[PDB]
Amino acid sequence: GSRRYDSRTTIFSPEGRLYQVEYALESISHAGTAIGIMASDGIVLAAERKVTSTLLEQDTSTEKLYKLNDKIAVAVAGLTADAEILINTARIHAQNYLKTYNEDIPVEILVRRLSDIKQGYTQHGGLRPFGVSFIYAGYDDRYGYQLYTSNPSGNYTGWKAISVGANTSAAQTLLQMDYKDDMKVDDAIELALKTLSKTTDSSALTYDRLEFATIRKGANDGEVYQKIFKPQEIKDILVKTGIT
Amino acid sequence: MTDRYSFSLTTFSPSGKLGQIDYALTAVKQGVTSLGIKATNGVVIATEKKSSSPLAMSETLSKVSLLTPDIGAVYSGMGPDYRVLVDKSRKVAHTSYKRIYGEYPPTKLLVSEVAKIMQEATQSGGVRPFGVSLLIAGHDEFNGFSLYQVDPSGSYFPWKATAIGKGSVAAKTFLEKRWNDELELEDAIHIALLTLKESVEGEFNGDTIELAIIGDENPDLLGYTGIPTDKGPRFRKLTSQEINDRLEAL
Amino acid sequence: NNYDGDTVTFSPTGRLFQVEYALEAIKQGSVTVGLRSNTHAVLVALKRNADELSSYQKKIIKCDEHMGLSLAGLAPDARVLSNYLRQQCNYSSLVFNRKLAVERAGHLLCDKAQKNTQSYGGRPYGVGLLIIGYDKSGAHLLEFQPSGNVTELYGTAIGARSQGAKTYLERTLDTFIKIDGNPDELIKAGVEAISQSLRDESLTVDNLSIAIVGKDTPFTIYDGEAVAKYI
Amino acid sequence: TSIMAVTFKDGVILGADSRTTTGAYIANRVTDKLTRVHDKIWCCRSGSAADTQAIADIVQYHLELYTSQYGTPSTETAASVFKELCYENKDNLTAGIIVAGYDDKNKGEVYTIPLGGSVHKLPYAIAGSGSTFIYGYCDKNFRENMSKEETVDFIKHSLSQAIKWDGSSGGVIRMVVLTAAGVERLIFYPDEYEQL
Amino acid sequence: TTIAGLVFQDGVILGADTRATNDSVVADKSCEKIHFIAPKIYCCGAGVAADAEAVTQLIGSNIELHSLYTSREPRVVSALQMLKQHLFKYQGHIGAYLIVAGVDPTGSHLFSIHAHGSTDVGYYLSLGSGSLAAMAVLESHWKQDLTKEEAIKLASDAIQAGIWNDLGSGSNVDVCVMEIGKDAEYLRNYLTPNVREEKQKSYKFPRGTTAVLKESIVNICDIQEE
Amino acid sequence: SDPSSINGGIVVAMTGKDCVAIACDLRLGSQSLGVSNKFEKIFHYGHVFLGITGLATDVTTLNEMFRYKTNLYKLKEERAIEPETFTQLVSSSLYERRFGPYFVGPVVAGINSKSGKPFIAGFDLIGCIDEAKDFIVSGTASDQLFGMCESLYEPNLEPEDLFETISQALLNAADRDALSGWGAVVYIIKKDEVVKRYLKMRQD
Amino acid sequence: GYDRHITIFSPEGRLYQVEYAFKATNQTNINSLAVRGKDCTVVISQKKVPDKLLDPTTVSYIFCISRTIGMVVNGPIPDARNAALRAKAEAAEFRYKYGYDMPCDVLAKRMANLSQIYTQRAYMRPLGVILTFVSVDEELGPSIYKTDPAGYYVGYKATATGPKQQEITTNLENHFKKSKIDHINEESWEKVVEFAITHMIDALGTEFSKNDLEVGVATKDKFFTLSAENIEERLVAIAEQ
Amino acid sequence: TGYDLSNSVFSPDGRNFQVEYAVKAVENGTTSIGIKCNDGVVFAVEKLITSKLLVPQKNVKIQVVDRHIGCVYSGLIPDGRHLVNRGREEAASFKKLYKTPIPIPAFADRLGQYVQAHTLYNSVRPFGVSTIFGGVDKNGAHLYMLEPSGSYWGYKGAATGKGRQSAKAELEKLVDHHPEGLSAREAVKQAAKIIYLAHEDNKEKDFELEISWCSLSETNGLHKFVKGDLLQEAIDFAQKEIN
């Protein structure tokens, strides 16, 4: 019968690892680097686009940075199509919570839910896992600014600064070197771009290659603003920090 | 008499490759060249009508398809896979959008729905990926003109101009030299015909080329009068005669 | 070899190896004999023990007042099939006020066994059955194999060393068929038949199991001191 | 409604009035109640218009699919498919259908299917609200093996009386002739039949 | 409601009034009761207004997808068959009464559909509470081989009969003309015989007439930003 | 027994010159018993305003439902929903509960951000759209509101005149209905400013 | 090498099960041909009854799908009948739902979409058949549409299918290169059948008796197959000029 | 290689090897035949007497469908029974809806489509039987033979099982020597002869002859078994011809 052709995606190796999760992580290690840095007065999300072509319409393009609600955003590393399936689920979960409790969903609850979906694909159903790692940048009134990551295993953890995708080993060493707890958003912006500039496989870091975003509690009158940077604005912040 | 294939046929190999997606992309590479160019006042999509026999009536085989009145599609790769995607794309535009909001979806969201269908064939049980790359050109009120590419993975990217299939590497280089942000629609059609001539071996005329535009509203093609707001479809497939006219000024 | 992984696969010579392997489980099972005359039908079964502390595994199951079987092979599969027969016998009584014909009982077992041989995931039944009964056309004896093949016979035997009993019955055919209106002599012929399949062990009081059905005799099983008479 | 089907020497003729009413308002005065389920198998509809149309459409579908696989269906087969729908959905239907058809083997045949979903093969059949008024007339005047002209007159005179007495019936008398020769439609206007 | 449809020389024409009612009050004075299905197939609706609207929109959506699939102009019989099978399924609970008319490769067609799923074929039809007023006019004046000019006159006259004599019907007359080999012309507010007369007085108030307890500015924008 | 008249309340909307106005009373009751004098019936999703009369549990449920749907709309479309599109979304959502409907009388009001055109619409409980040029009424005193609007209204009123007209239409209608009143709110909506005014009215 | 057993991509981007289904097409060793007249569409096919014990009247690869549509199959008979029964069902369902007779090209598309599903879904195998649909469509006129195991379909001016399809195809190509029209300019279907048979004789280089051929003719509002005696009359007329 | 391990897999030839392996199970089985006569059909089968303990005339192999169709098969006997059970369901639902008993060509396609369906999926095994069947309907007599692939044709004479070549040769003589046709009573005699001649392939064990027939004149178009004197007359005719 059909048994013959079954890869068996949800089994342990003799060493106690999940084959498909490990291979999905290998897939993600080739994806464009995404960095999240959390400051006292905000969060930075920086990410490197993978497919440099001059003919790519950049201003209408979105492969890395997605909005989940007004308070929470994600940076993606891996298969974009897989990420979009999960993103739309997370967008619905946030609105279900808002409908039920009449309050914006706490960041960790949203993260756990997505992470639980990913976990399910590793334990049952016989389907391949999602080849996606997220960096979640968000704010709520309990814990304030939060950074998380999730990976295809469905394990998630909290961070002050973190990278996913390509050259994370190199990137995490550089962040660990220059990060400090009293840091501010403007400093974190500079750290994120400097880290990408050194770890990038490209010859030089330019505006047409980057997606960039900030979550600040520096909106008018103590609200939280999500800013997804336009191409010209990425070009300006590259000149300001002194990279181009 | 059971469907026992409830498990993924596309899986990660040790190197992190999704084999079936890569192989689907190889099938797209073998397919006939198609291209898309975006102008200031329009978009053009074009491909070669590679006729399998001269007895076959190549007019009956439509490689360039209307999805909505303001959105069109063209492909490279496996034709049958494309045909069923067009059927699903037309239907999803109604079920998940028009029947809710009373208007056709914008280009990016219809593309998103097609992408989703293609992604599901890359993860669901007992199916292979679609062996096509699509180029979807369209217009909507708030985004203006746009051109999208959709791959077997479900990934999609917006383009100013691009090409897919057989001679795409050479064609994309040709388009990089010629494209600028001040192109009129007629200039883009002219560039499309020049680019497409390089990848075509045999006959090069209106009968062997399929070409459509997303341009101005066509109230003449609407079929009715009496509603000022409905001004007619922006999608228009160029006739065999209309192509030949522009090939004289080539 | 390559074509024995499941029941759904024919071999290149047109064989179903999983069915043949199920057939093999019957040959490993303990011997049981069936025979009949025009008036009565008899089952005789050599029961098997695990060791001297254990009981002897029961071989004969009652299906209705006028029908029952003996088993050889996987006993849980006999339980499933006998339960199915009980239900079909019972359905015939409740709905039609009709005792189920033994020939029709065989047809039902055949079709139940067949479904397991043509579909994926399932396995063949690992048991052979000898069904006796007395219905509106007199005494009957059936042999069920889990391939699906059911066969109406005057006499037969299945299990280990069953060829000895089967040859005896083939010689005795003309004698035992005439044993009409004499249950004890028909059982004697069955006990003498099953004795041809014995080696080393002999028929003791808790070893032997006999059943009978006939004209004015409901299907009844004899075990223990009730079979000492025939030893 | 006044409907009838009558067997005769050369085949069968179906006849009907043309009035459809919603209470006392005549919703349609030129209704066609003679409806085709196959080339030479027709039916007369009475009861709920929605129900009889829904049934007739399904039967036409079944006989079309029968023909693609097994060739031309018998009139008996058509009547059976009508019956199966009417009987199995008797709780949700108000349909009184007469089925009439021409084979070359069986010649003219008429089957009536009243409310219950029973089938009755008959030499002729009458149905609809206006039929009550012509049981006496039709019984006295029907003969077997009539000619075409006699059967047309028998139906014309019959439905004329049904129309005269029943308010629910009226308009034109439509007829459909089913013979080896083919299918002929006839129509008869008030000025013709009223003066009979 | 007064809706009507009739055929002429090389076409079919539909007419409708523009009044929507809730019991005895007028909910809408300018509603479009001639629904769009395909470019050359139109549908007049009576009964429950939401139902007539929803069923025409649904069949119109499915007709569009069918037309794309088959690469053919949609036929009026397809709309007719789809509408009736839907309406029959719901057993009259979708209380829509429709006159369907159009042009296709087969020719010009005119049908009526009832809420329970029955259909009629006709040369002239009318539905709704004003059907009897309209049908009286159509029975008096309809003939074979009407010109387009005569057909528009008769259709609008039939609708007018409903407007004046039926309380359910009122306001303006909408028409749609579907002629063979030509674009269908949809003529909303074809007649306007019920414009309100100028008022005697202006009831515009002196400013400050209304007593106010509080005032505030509503923030409708996204993020007022730093 | 009739769900649309258990709780009571009213909404009225009007168009003016380059502006729209939508207004509502503040009462929530259990038939004769007045319960709340702060139950607002007008909500907004970006720049589109939705008034809802009828059964109060459905008013609250639908508000939460359209907030949900317009939030997702905005994330996917990357723009706020417009009044014309939202009207179609309300109609759709109501009609999908055709045979178990929400017992409500919704009213949409807003200005299209691109064309600048004032827009109002009303619905029955199963989603039939009434897209009026002049005014829309809804609630237990809808007859009273129809009478006031039909006489008081004139086209192309300036924002501060339109305020007076809609306020007097609401107040005098509410005072002839037992189940309406207990306070009132009026929104005056222009292309990029919205003023909200609470009215002084009799508290019986 | 399980990429060759089920319908998934090989490293070359190929579906081997689809390619092998195309090879099953020629297992019968029968050649078919279809051409269009002014008012008609004719389809001819070789008929081979090797066994004397066979009832030759039951040996057929031409099917009456609906009144208007005919279908000739190149491939094994079980798959041919599978396809025939489905097409009949689809044609009947279409008429019931949409109120008019299913067009030839729409049926072809529908069957091609079903064939596409077997190339994408693993549990279903492709049918090893090429389906040639013929009619006189009420909108498009004389019509030939052909479907294969890949799910590909297209309209044809004329077509040929089988082991010796290339010989028949080139023969037809050369005729239409001369005439410079998309059809056989002939009034009666009888002469269009005579053309079809003549050009198959020339292309294959074999003579035919009445029992060696099988003919289907589509006219306005009906498709029918010719009897052996109707074909004999056709063969007599060919020989006499 | 590996193309023969799973049902519904095309080999590079374009063949389904599992179906071809089911044919080997059919070729292994006992001989069965069918003869079309003037106004009906005759079915006959070879039943191997494995042992003296088999009760004569009891293990009946030929099966009736409805009241007018006979079915006989060679190969895996349970698979044949499963197919006839389905055939009975098909014949019942046809009669339920359309009133008339199922025509033989209609019935043939019902079995044909069902057998063909078991070559479409790897989750099922093909049928290990070739089935000879037929009867009398409104259009006269019909004889069919159905293979594991789902393939079936109409026949003048049909034969399958281990002695099929021998039988086929004998049937071919009858077709040549009787173009005007064969009577029902003649066909019974000839069927007995052909089974006796075909028994040379299974000559080790002795056998039991079983014959059935549908004929418009002899059985009123109903399926009946040949019994008693008519059976013995056919056995005597057959025994005389071999000697």
Ligand SMILES: *[C@@H](CS(C)(=O)=O)[C@H](Cc1ccc(CN)cc1)NC(=O)[C@H](COC)NC(=O)[C@H](CC(C)C)NC(=O)c1cnc(C)s1
């Ligand atoms: C006339 C129908 S009549 C009097 O039965 O002949 C119109 C037809 C019509 C069709 C389409 C549209 C708009 N596309 C408008 C009007 N129908 C009506 O006036 C109907 C009432 O007829 C019985 N009006 C409604 O159905 C109203 C909705 C409009 C006011 C927008 N709804 C209701 O009255 C109710 C629905 N459910 C309730 C409970 S109350």
Ligand SMILES: [Cl-]
């Ligand atoms: Cl389809």
Ligand SMILES: [Mg+2]
């Ligand atoms: Mg009368």
Ligand SMILES: [Mg+2]
């Ligand atoms: Mg009050």
Ligand SMILES: [Mg+2]
């Ligand atoms: Mg009070």
Ligand SMILES: [Mg+2]
């Ligand atoms: Mg497959």
